[PDB]
Amino acid sequence: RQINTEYAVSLLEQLKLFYEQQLFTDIVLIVEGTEFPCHKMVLATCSSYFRAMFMSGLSESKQTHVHLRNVDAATLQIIITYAYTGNLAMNDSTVEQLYETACFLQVEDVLQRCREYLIKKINAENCVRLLSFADLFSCEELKQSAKRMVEHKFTAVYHQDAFMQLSHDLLIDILSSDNLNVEKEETVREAAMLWLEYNTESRSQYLSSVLSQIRIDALSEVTQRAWFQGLPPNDKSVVVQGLYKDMPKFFKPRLGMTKEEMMIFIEASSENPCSLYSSVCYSPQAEKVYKLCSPPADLHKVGTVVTPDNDIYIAGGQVPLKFRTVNCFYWFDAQQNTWFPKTPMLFVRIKPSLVCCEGYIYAIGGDSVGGELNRRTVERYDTEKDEWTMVSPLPCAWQWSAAVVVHDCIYVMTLNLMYCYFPRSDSWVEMAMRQTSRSFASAAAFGDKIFYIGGLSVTVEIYDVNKNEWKMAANIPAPCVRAVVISNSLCVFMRETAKYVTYQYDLELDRWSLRQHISERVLWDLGRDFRCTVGKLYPSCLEESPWKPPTYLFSTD
Amino acid sequence: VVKEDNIEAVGKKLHEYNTQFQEKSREYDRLYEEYTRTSQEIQMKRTAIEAFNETIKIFEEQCQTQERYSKEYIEKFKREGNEKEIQRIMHNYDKLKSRISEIIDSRRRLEEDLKKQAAEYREIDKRMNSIKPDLIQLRKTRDQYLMWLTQKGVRQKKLNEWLGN
Amino acid sequence: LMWLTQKGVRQKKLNEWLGN
């Protein structure tokens, strides 16, 4: 019928065998003294540059020796190896030079592969360098991705040396963007100052363009501090999602002045049957719920973890049988409301205990008991390296266990025992046991004390990290509880099968005070298996969908 | 019941009244949801317009603070024959006036949005005021028929099937 | 019924309670 694949792979392997023994070599490429015999047809079919050079009919198609300059020998070898096979060795050490050589040779396949690899490899350490690279080589997709990454973590990357060596257009397009994740304009002002003072003799003429991009007369959230905070309870968030929108974009409050602390509920049951495992985030300050497009592959049984840098991650879980367990790792883009996948895990897990410790995210347990040494395995992920490293596994196989982090130390709790992990020692130490044997309990690290609340019957058990002793505090004022720390205060979001209400606990007085009721106006039944956490998100452009009539039960009579 | 006694025909009427009543309850709770969304809308728009007002007030405070600077520390920035040093309040003045103009235009935009949403809300608020007497009248007629036509050989399951279509 | 029944009671247990 058409091109047969069975002969195609045989012809390709025969061409490779002929190239290895140097048969029918008609062209000789000279790169910085090194010689490479090759065929003109393969280079023409793979690279359009060689195609145009050979189809011109000039001496280049007649002379056997062609001198190629400004081309690395290793990159040319990788291009030619790929030209005779199809496997691309893309590593983080030589990806930029490979992309440069490909764009100089115009290999569409290699160009696209290197582009997508660089896009899936943008971290918080190379974002600025990759942005400069994309600007120099005019790659719009990589440029936009790196710009978004810089806008997401500007306050963390504006100290790097790559930021002070940026061009003028990059500076004026980064500073003018309203997506700068900064809590104060003073940070952007000091960034511009250090950029202009890095090289004064060449940037003394750009001081006007520098000062014209920093908002000085904005006065975003200081004007509210001048008059008063007099409003309905914590209605400063309404001004955030109101004044910001309607703004000439010159005095606009930057995106960093818009993030609000919201209770992130994932796998929260939804009235809509299609998405019975949806995810919504109720803002305690704005008193409003915001819809999330959280499920990237309509799956569930995934854990939640919020780093101190306010980053959301989900891992583990299983997709419906097209319920096969998977390894995908998803990071949430708080600006685009879309999860970008990462390097999959090494072992499949179901609701893994994900906690952030010393910049690493650890996957603890969260899987059905299979194999003595095969289970209880613990694995951590490197953020910048995008890799998974195995660590000392769990001492014993547990179920429905929780994990917290205090003082850069890992803690996992079980029925009545407790083990503390130290990354510096990579070992497990059994700690003070608990007087009660309970399951399905929720735990949240607050200050120097770990709170263990649950049991499936509620009892507030306080552990001291400094004393290694467990002391009883009280009971949850009531049961489906979710202990979460918000507003620098320990709280418990309890669901009374459904009624919703949040309580505040006093550590000194050992008393639980009513903090705020969550009227059934919105926040419908979220089920019982939903995972909860605390994080700051931009309500400005997250999602807007009430979905719930705040009034019902007509009283006309 | 239009003086009828076919029983089966009287029951068919009961089903027509069923339709009328059901359609109303749906539009009734729909108008209630519209009332609630319009209520929260004007609340969000009033928390926005008072924010606009207080921002205009603090911007006028900055405008008079410029006049205060014209006597506080302007002595060492105008008599030296330089214009780049004074841009910190002089180039921050004309653009502040333009900001005042554009936020006044934005306030006018919010005001016309307020009046247009109030118009589109009152054009149906009057419908609520007129549909409720007719609704309660239809419900009273249904309750009166439920005290006579229903006792002529119809079952409660039949009434549920009639009101469920 | 909305509260205590959904802890760990059986409908059959409720019938036996209401049948005495």
Swiss-Prot record, chain A:
InterPro entries: BACK (IPR011705), BTB-kelch_protein (IPR017096), BTB/POZ_dom (IPR000210), BTB_POZ_KBTBD2 (IPR030586), KBTBD2_BACK (IPR047074), Kelch-typ_b-propeller (IPR015915), Kelch_1 (IPR006652), SKP1/BTB/POZ_sf (IPR011333). It comes from the Eukaryota. The modification Phosphoserine is found at S294. Pathway: Protein modification; protein ubiquitination. Kelch repeats lie at residues 311-359, 360-408, 410-448, 449-485, 491-532. GO terms for cellular component: Cul3-RING ubiquitin ligase complex; cytoplasm. Substrate-specific adapter of a BCR (BTB-CUL3-RBX1) E3 ubiquitin ligase complex that acts as a regulator of the insulin signaling pathway, modulating insulin sensitivity by limiting PIK3R1/p85alpha abundance in adipocytes. Targets PIK3R1, the regulatory subunit of phosphatidylinositol 3-kinase (PI3K), for 'Lys-48'-linked polyubiquitination and proteasome-mediated degradation. This is Kelch repeat and BTB domain-containing protein 2. It comes from Homo sapiens.
Swiss-Prot record, chain B:
Polyubiquitinated in T-cells by CBLB; which does not promote proteasomal degradation but impairs association with CD28 and CD3Z upon T-cell activation. Isoform 2 is expressed in skeletal muscle and brain, and at lower levels in kidney and cardiac muscle. Isoform 2 and isoform 4 are present in skeletal muscle (at protein level). The modification Phosphotyrosine is found at Y32, Y145. Heterodimer of a regulatory subunit PIK3R1 and a p110 catalytic subunit (PIK3CA, PIK3CB or PIK3CD). Interacts (via SH2 domains) with CCDC88A/GIV (tyrosine-phosphorylated form); the interaction enables recruitment of PIK3R1 to the EGFR receptor, enhancing PI3K activity and cell migration. Interacts (via SH2 domain) with CSF1R (tyrosine phosphorylated). Interacts with PIK3R2; the interaction is dissociated in an insulin-dependent manner. (Microbial infection) Interacts with HIV-1 Nef to activate the Nef associated p21-activated kinase (PAK). This interaction depends on the C-terminus of both proteins and leads to increased production of HIV. Binds to activated (phosphorylated) protein-Tyr kinases, through its SH2 domain, and acts as an adapter, mediating the association of the p110 catalytic unit to the plasma membrane. Necessary for the insulin-stimulated increase in glucose uptake and glycogen synthesis in insulin-sensitive tissues. Plays an important role in signaling in response to FGFR1, FGFR2, FGFR3, FGFR4, KITLG/SCF, KIT, PDGFRA and PDGFRB. Likewise, plays a role in ITGB2 signaling. The SH3 domain mediates the binding to CBLB, and to HIV-1 Nef. Belongs to the PI3K p85 subunit family. This is Phosphatidylinositol 3-kinase regulatory subunit alpha. The chain holds residues 436 to 600 of 724 of the full protein.
UniProtKB/Swiss-Prot annotation, chain C:
It is linked to Agammaglobulinemia 7, autosomal recessive: A primary immunodeficiency characterized by profoundly low or absent serum antibodies and low or absent circulating B-cells due to an early block of B-cell development. Affected individuals develop severe infections in the first years of life. Polyubiquitinated in T-cells by CBLB; which does not promote proteasomal degradation but impairs association with CD28 and CD3Z upon T-cell activation. Binds to activated (phosphorylated) protein-Tyr kinases, through its SH2 domain, and acts as an adapter, mediating the association of the p110 catalytic unit to the plasma membrane. Necessary for the insulin-stimulated increase in glucose uptake and glycogen synthesis in insulin-sensitive tissues. Plays an important role in signaling in response to FGFR1, FGFR2, FGFR3, FGFR4, KITLG/SCF, KIT, PDGFRA and PDGFRB. Likewise, plays a role in ITGB2 signaling. Belongs to the PI3K p85 subunit family. Heterodimer of a regulatory subunit PIK3R1 and a p110 catalytic subunit (PIK3CA, PIK3CB or PIK3CD). Interacts (via SH2 domains) with CCDC88A/GIV (tyrosine-phosphorylated form); the interaction enables recruitment of PIK3R1 to the EGFR receptor, enhancing PI3K activity and cell migration. Interacts (via SH2 domain) with CSF1R (tyrosine phosphorylated). Interacts with PIK3R2; the interaction is dissociated in an insulin-dependent manner. (Microbial infection) Interacts with HIV-1 Nef to activate the Nef associated p21-activated kinase (PAK). This interaction depends on the C-terminus of both proteins and leads to increased production of HIV. This is Phosphatidylinositol 3-kinase regulatory subunit alpha. The chain holds residues 581 to 600 of 724 of the full protein. Coiled coil: none annotated. It comes from Homo sapiens.
